[PDB]
Ligand binder design. Structure first.
Ligand code: NAP
Ligand code: FOL
Ligand code: MN
Ligand code: MN
Ligand code: MN
Length: 159
């Protein structure tokens, strides 16, 4: 099974200038809980944005060019990325925009955080078709002293 996990600001913005400008510790904690002990697939730009391997996960990087770091696994196509995960119950795709586009048609589950923040951005989560997806979990949180925007965690499953 393939799942995508992402955090979206208003208008599906996910990034600006190869960064995420907000800081929501509760959402990073949600990301860690839902990805720990699973393989994670990311594009090269997202690898450079994170800047280091994510511990406790098999890190698989898509790039058309040879890898430059043997602490992670480098692959050159979507099918190779999936194969490199082996026989696991759930593969997590962690972006960015170009990678989400390619894996969305293959995904059964979306883990989405909707953040109430207006962000100028240059990268968006793909338009997906709402009729294809059932919301199976949603949890709203108001802003607090640690998290400066309100946010909603949602899990959707392909119908
Ligand atoms: N809010 C969130 O949830 C979230 C999550 C992830 C990322 N982001 C943000 O998203 C932005 C990065 O997204 P992006 O769309 O620019 O880049 P990306 O999807 O992270 O990376 C694209 C790169 O991945 C490689 N690639 C993708 N598909 C491939 C394929 N089929 N075969 C081979 N290589 C492939 C290519 O690398 P080469 O050029 O080396 O061939 C391509 O240039 C940043 O702003 C980041 O902060 C946000
Ligand atoms: N919901 C969601 N939020 C995100 O921030 C997110 N980020 C990415 C890609 N970028 C990043 C950037 C940083 C870390 C990171 O530092 N993660 C630590 C945090 C642990 C914690 O804060 O408790 C990790 O070990 O996962 C992960 C992904 C992909 N999907 C996402 N999905
Ligand atoms: Mn092929
Ligand atoms: Mn197999
Ligand atoms: Mn806000």
């Amino acid at each position: 099974m393939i799942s995508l996990i992402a955090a979206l600001a208003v208008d599906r913005v996910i990034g600006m200038e190869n960064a995420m400008p907000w800081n929501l510790p509760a959402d990073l904690a949600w990301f860690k809980r839902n990805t720990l002990n699973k393989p994670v697939i990311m594009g090269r730009h997202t690898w450079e944005s994170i800047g280091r391997p994510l511990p406790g996960r098999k890190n698989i990087i898509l790039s058309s060019q040879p890898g430059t770091d043997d602490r992670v696994t480098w692959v050159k196509s979507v099918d190779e990325a999936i194969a490199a995960c082996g026989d696991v119950p759930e593969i997590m795709v962690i972006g960015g925009g170009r990678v989400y586009e390619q894996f969305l048609p293959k995904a059964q589950k979306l883990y989405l955080t909707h953040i109430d923040a207006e962000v100028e951005g240059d990268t968006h989560f793909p338009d997906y078709e709402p009729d294809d997806w059932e919301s199976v979990f949603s949890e709203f949180h108001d802003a607090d002293a640690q998290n400066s925007h309100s946010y909603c965690f949602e899990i959707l499953e392909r119908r």
